Symmetry: C2
Subunit: 204 residues, 2 copies
Amino acid sequence: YDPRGKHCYITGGSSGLGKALAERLVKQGAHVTIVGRDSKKAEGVVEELKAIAAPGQIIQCIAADLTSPIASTNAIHAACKPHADQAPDYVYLCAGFSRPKLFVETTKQELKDGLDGVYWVSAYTAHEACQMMSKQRRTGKIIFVASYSSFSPAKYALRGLSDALRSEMLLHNIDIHIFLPITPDVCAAALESGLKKGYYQITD
Amino acid sequence: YDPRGKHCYITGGSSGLGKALAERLVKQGAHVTIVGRDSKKAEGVVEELKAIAAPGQIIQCIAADLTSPIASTNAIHAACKPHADQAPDYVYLCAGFSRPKLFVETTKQELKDGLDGVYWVSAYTAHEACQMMSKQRRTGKIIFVASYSSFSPAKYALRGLSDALRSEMLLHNIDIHIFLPITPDVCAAALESGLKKGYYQITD
């Protein structure tokens, strides 16, 4: 886990923990690609980080709804045209919304929306991510982030997919990790902490 | 947990564990409603069980894809027109398919299909189920069944929803349970076993 000079593709990088992670993955000296839906929100942060980058560091961003398989697929693909079609190395999955409610209060379309909102954002990407490194036959990491509710299912699903992959994808020699979390940049340290120390599961 | 004279609505009741459960929930003396997709498969089992029922026991079945919110919603509603619009008492969630594969091998549409296949079949029902007892303001139980992969997420999701509900729905005074499993009828005993003994989590 040496991030410097490495493509770091970070979903949800335009808000809390995801932005934080970019801040430092830059300070250290990576190529940092943030994804989000809000173009201005992200292209703002882009230039904020562009400031403190040393010249020649690719610091781009991409507007996409990562609840669409196609958007998820086109995004990661987009972010490597600059990087000579080199797959990313380190991929960070921080996209998420939390609009908490009561089961009985909730429409079925509300439930579907919340799973799409928390699971697939991470999963649809993670898929095409592996599919990329696999076929290019390169390595590098995939890092999931998790943590009245009824988003809970979606969080468990992530653990579920982490665990399935953390098995499987050591046939295509790909690291798999997951986070179980304080100013975001704190949690950011916890993560880089446990990552250099190689644990598959990481807390604060 | 006295099943006799109680509406027992059982998704996936036309195959393994779900059929088994009907066998005994009849032998004991319930009103038993099996749901499945295969009309002949189910209307077969229906009459098989109709044999061994004592007269006056409502033993019906319903063909529905429980991956549609509307099908899931119309089914449970259908199965209570005979039962004087009385919500079910005991609801058993055994619908499921397992078509195991490699992540890298899998299409994104394959993954979506597998979650729909294992989670929503149970969840879309469980929702309308509660929504029914809640608004009728009656009690009764909701029982989830769980247990290279990439159906794993969907299993974790169930545990996830079980856990969320097992909290929440003790505001609408509704029992919540879950199964973690041998001839199906074995597992069937394990379940009725731990259910009369009131544990929320049940193994074999």
